[PDB]
Amino acid sequence: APTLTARLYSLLFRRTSTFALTIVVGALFFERAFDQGADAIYEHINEGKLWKHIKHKYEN
Amino acid sequence: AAKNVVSQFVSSMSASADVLAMSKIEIKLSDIPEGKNMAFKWRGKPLFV
Amino acid sequence: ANAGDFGGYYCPCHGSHYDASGRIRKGPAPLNLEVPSYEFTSDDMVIVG
Amino acid sequence: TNIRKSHPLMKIVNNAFIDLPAPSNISSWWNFGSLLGICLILQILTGLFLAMHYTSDTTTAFSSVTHICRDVNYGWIIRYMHANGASMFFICLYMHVGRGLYYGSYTFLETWNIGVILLLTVMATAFMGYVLPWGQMSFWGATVITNLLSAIPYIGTNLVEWIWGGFSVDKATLTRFFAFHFILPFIIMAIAMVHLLFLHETGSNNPTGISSDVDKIPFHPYYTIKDILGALLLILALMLLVLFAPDLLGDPDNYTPANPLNTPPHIKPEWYFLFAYAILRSIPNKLGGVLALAFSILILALIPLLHTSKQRSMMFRPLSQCLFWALVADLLTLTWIGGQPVEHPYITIGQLASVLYFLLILVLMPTAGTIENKLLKW
Amino acid sequence: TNIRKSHPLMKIVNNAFIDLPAPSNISSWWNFGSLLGICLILQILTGLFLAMHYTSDTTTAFSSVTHICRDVNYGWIIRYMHANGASMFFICLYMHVGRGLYYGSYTFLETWNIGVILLLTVMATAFMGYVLPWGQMSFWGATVITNLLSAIPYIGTNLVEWIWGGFSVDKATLTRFFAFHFILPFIIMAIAMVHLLFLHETGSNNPTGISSDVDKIPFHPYYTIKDILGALLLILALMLLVLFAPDLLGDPDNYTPANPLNTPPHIKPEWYFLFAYAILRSIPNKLGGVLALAFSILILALIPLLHTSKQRSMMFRPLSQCLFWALVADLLTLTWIGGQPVEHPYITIGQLASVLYFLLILVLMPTAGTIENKLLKW
Amino acid sequence: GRQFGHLTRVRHVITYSLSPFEQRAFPHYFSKGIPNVLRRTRACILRVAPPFVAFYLVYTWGTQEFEKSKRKNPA
Amino acid sequence: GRQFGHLTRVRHVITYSLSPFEQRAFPHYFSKGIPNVLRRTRACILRVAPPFVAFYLVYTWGTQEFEKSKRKNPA
Amino acid sequence: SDLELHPPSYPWSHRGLLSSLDHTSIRRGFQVYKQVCSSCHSMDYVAYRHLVGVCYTEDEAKALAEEVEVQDGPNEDGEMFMRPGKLSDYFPKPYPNPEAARAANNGALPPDLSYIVRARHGGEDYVFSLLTGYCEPPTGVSLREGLYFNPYFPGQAIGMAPPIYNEVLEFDDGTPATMSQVAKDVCTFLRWAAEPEHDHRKRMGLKMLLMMGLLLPLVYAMKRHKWSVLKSRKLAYRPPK
Amino acid sequence: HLVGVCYTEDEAKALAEEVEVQDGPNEDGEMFMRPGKLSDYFPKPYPNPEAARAANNGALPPDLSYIVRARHGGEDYVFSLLTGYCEPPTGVSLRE
Amino acid sequence: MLTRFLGPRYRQLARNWVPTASLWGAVGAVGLVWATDWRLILDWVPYINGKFK
């Protein structure tokens, strides 16, 4: 009943210290989530990569 | 974006695929007599048998 | 090879004395000389890698 | 007192990038200066990381470039960032010069005249670099450009053989070119600082060509954030080239190793040299052609003396606007003719476009400014 | 008004080299700054002309240096001007630092602290260059110095392999070193301008260590002609080296091509690194030795905090004078021990000289300044 | 080098400004924006466009002519 | 950057100077010169010289000792 | 001579902006290189380790290198011996010189095939059209018959005989080895040989566009925020009387 | 290199003419042997370092282009090496 | 000579800046961990286990 922007400001954005801490924690979690999605999008587009490699491995 | 460019420029200075390749060396053991240290070229930098 | 006060190895650069196991005994060096990964298939030939 | 204001080093940064009084009203077209600076640092960084792996012998020059692109970790992005960065550099150079022309920014005599030197220096830089991978176009491009000097009466042959280090483009030539190509962007960086010094005497011109002392804003935050946005648009355009079309502006003959015995049938410059190339081969004479080519770039140093209008900018000048856009389209035509064989329609139209280039600048635009003055009872 | 005074470019030259208020009484010892600048431009010019012919592959690096000295017209003078210019650079560096130490010129905090950076940057420069001809000393010198980084806890191995581009000093290492060696003197040139900027805030110190505002003379003609004479004395000393003793400071093992499988029995630095080399091998520990070596150069940044005297200069300070000359002679001793095998008298005296170096600076000279204060009732 | 306080003389001008936190970054972005770009296009078309069309016509003629020149029909 | 006119306050000092064209470049060059260098040498010798002699003595001992250490006489 | 025909646009699995190479089609195309082309064509810039990522396993590529003898530099006599073949070694060279290439092929030099896609206008489209486009000469046109008719080659007289209707190759998965399909696989492989970075380039390309789609509107919103102060400013002129 | 120094142009051409070289190929792709010119370098006794070691019972004879500048003493060392061969003293046995 | 900075005002100024100095320490540590992809710490963060095997 106060806003989420208001809470994100009050708790995190007011101090430049916590603002910087938010971005760096933000960047680590973003790098994981962005790479995981952007691989999976590229993977779904393509399907002749080493999707095939069940054929030739495990025989070894 | 900055992490990714910087890492890529950093990685370019790392050992290229060129350099990482397996080498491996054959040594004839009977050609090394009792007492003796023989020095062979391996990986650029010497192997003592 | 075959030099120093231990009958293994002497490094002339700063005065490292190694024994016949390649183990450090005297002078500046922190560690015994590097043992590579090896196996014997015959007692005529050894592959190191 | 602030630290920012009176610290002897931070003083310089303050007066250039923070507290610098800037026109409120400078457009998009003023982004290209910072973008040229970005282009220079991009060429510096990628180029150093290429210099870490490139070797400059004829036997190994092509192979070392190949080694970058297969074997060196991310050598391909660095290589292509560099090749396409050179093109970005010329795109930004041309937009920047064109801004200067249209807006009367050339009235800053010293700033402009140094910009000409900056243009001739990046041209020499990018020529010598293109030679370096020792492809077919590298070699014959090296051959054609270096031979332009042989047209100079009496001393010409002695001059070219001196810059070869021999009787043709060879071993001595390539290594030379690596050394000169390394040094010249650091010289560029120093001349770019001198350029910026001369500019700070007056500050910026604006779209209106009217003094903006009445309405200055601080460079920071306004043009710091405007320049950031500009840089991210440069990164988009560069990365589109590297990650989607890396060979689009490259000649395929440069993927064949240099052959000293056989030319390509075609032979064409990179896109940014095609207007000047069209101007050279328009003249059926050796000396005439090169003199025309030299004069096609060096004319920019005469543009201050041919200003004739009582207004600085072309904003309030419809006649000059039509003639300016006629120049741009003439230059587009010359870039088209540059990239085509010396055959039937292309010869005569290449001649006509070459005449019109020199007619617009030397005659037509200074006549438009005078007519426009007379029209305004001035 | 003069042109010289208010032209935006000539302004800078005026305030640095013409109208600059200078102490009437600055000696010979103040010549070394201009001489360091001369040394930098000498290294730039000869180095570029070497870069025109040198190739940076392991197969061809030695051969290309040989090619310079037999086949390239006057390649031998350029090569030897360069090698001996590097030595001249270090002779001038050491005289200049020593002047600073004795005369309390280090009280200019920012000027001094940039000079330290200048020293670490020329050291890195001259190391990477010496590698380039790919002799035996080039290689094993490359091996010893690069391995100093492997002593760093946890990250050390990863750091050295990164700067190698591989498991030893190899193909990747040499080409790297050519690129870094080309770029760094231009970075030096920029830091040298920043050095001179910080200095011009105060002007020069003098022999007396007393403010000379009461007795300033214009830089021109006085120090323009004094610096000319200084330069001609530098040219004499350089040319004596190149034209009469070109191999005097060179190691003969560098005339044998690099062997990766066999060290030289001796292994010694160039003369200017021999004190630091003596300090490193004084410690029977890996990390201890390198930390001692690093601290032997980096101590100069602590010399401002250990000033204890109420007088700036050592001119009126006989105790400090005796201890300063004791440092110089300790450094001579350390350069002697540096150049000798790790055997009986040389080990213990090398240890004692190493202790005394750190004892003079950290303890003995700041005790002398305090005693001298007490003696003058101050 | 020019500095604030030393630029020029201005008398009798009031400027009113709002904080960026008080106000819209994109105020009437399409509803006022696209009328403005349309007005800007109209203002400049007659100066910009006619040289480029004249290039295009010389381009399309020149390519067509050259293509058609590289053919016989009697010998 | 420091400039003449802005350095410091000086009162009551007269300087007399001659033109270089009126005067000698090397006035009493040996007859006054060598007495001065002799006086300068005396003033500094006791500070400069004794560290270097102490190096020389450690040099000559150290070289002699090492040379003589690299010999046997019984086995 | 003089007159030219230019290649059509074939819809490769790798044409579109985010479209990777078919690596199964890379696998088959190597086999075309090994079986057919390598007897006449050098591929000086691909080694056996390059295949390991792409179209084979580590064990497979070791075994393929094992098929050829190399020459290694000497032991103690100073000798040059022949060697069973490794992974570090490059694809094997048919000829010691360019002149030896010309001597075998009646004066014509077969060009290196490492960069041949990137070294011709049209890329793979040209190579496909060269391979599948061999026909009879028209009336008026006689050759040497040392030289052969191709309408896609400039000048029309190619020194390469059709290498292609020959129905070759061990096939493993075992697709039909038609002239069309053998050309499709070889061109897919020759793209890879010219451009090993192709797949990484486009993955990066997507990642760029997605990031730029975020970052461009956001930086724009930042510049709009700061510039708001100016873009909504009101002026009034209030002179005396 | 000899032409400036110790011979005439004609003399040095004739001295090069004494040895056969190997030149790079004609049209067959061949490698032929050649009467010898002035551009050619002094002739090499061995194709490898290992071939040098094989002839000289394990020892490698070093290249002699820089050998004066590559040893302390210079010419004095080389002269003393050449004119200073003697019998071993008692205590000292070699391989021979 | 650095006795200057010892007294109740300077202790209070230390106390005021300490949550900030430690929060900046938190920025730096998480920043270094992120930029090097650091092994020891990032195996222990319960999402971001994108090595696995």
Ligand code: HEM
């Ligand atoms: C195997 C299917 C194969 C391919 C693929 C191929 C490619 C090819 C190209 C792209 C050219 C270049 C043409 C050009 O210059 O634009 C070309 C050239 C020649 N080749 Fe080839 N080649 C294939 C295999 C073979 C085989 C098996 C032989 C021997 C019968 C052969 C020979 C040649 C020759 C000769 C040329 C040079 C032609 C010329 O310029 O006159 N190739 N190859």
Ligand code: HEM
């Ligand atoms: C090495 C490439 C160059 C760099 C780095 C560069 C740098 C810049 C910078 C930062 C600006 C200020 C911002 C702006 O107006 O864009 C600028 C302005 C200027 N530049 Fe350049 N420049 C270069 C090339 C040129 C060239 C080739 C010329 C034309 C011959 C030119 C002439 C000018 C002029 C006249 C201005 C004043 C513009 C005005 O205020 O309207 N510069 N330069």
Ligand code: HEM
């Ligand atoms: C001092 C920084 C620079 C260094 C050290 C440098 C070094 C290099 C090297 C090593 C190459 C050869 C490798 C290659 O071709 O990919 C190269 C080529 C190139 N250089 Fe630079 N460069 C620098 C800046 C410049 C600048 C300012 C320009 C002009 C915009 C430029 C234009 C290019 C071009 C066009 C090529 C050819 C690229 C190609 O097509 O392969 N470079 N340079």
Ligand code: HEM
């Ligand atoms: C890249 C090599 C360097 C150059 C080109 C150089 C440049 C110079 C110049 C031109 C002067 C003025 C004239 C003079 O007093 O000599 C000077 C003064 C000074 N330099 Fe350097 N310098 C360099 C190295 C250093 C080093 C290594 C240090 C010591 C860490 C040093 C510290 C200073 C100081 C303190 C002065 C003030 C001297 C005084 O007025 O008494 N500089 N520098």
Ligand code: HEM
């Ligand atoms: C940016 C200007 C410079 C360039 C382009 C350059 C380039 C060169 C090149 C090509 C070599 C290899 C050829 C040779 O060994 O003779 C060389 C070696 C050398 N460089 Fe530089 N150099 C530069 C300035 C420097 C500076 C400032 C120093 C430090 C005083 C330095 C120290 C040396 C040394 C010690 C060697 C080894 C000389 C030898 O014994 O052969 N150079 N450099």
Ligand SMILES: C[C@@]1(c2ccc(F)cc2F)OC(=O)N(Nc2ccccc2)C1=O
């Ligand atoms: C990149 C290029 C170039 C750059 C800048 C310049 F001012 C002139 C040039 F020719 O260098 C080069 O060799 N070519 N190629 C070329 C030059 C003359 C005839 C044909 C090709 C260029 O376009």
Ligand SMILES: C[C@@]1(c2ccc(F)cc2F)OC(=O)N(Nc2ccccc2)C1=O
């Ligand atoms: C020239 C030299 C050098 C120059 C500056 C420096 F700060 C350190 C150095 F080692 O580079 C090099 O490889 N050696 N040689 C050397 C280094 C360590 C052990 C033995 C020789 C140098 O003296």
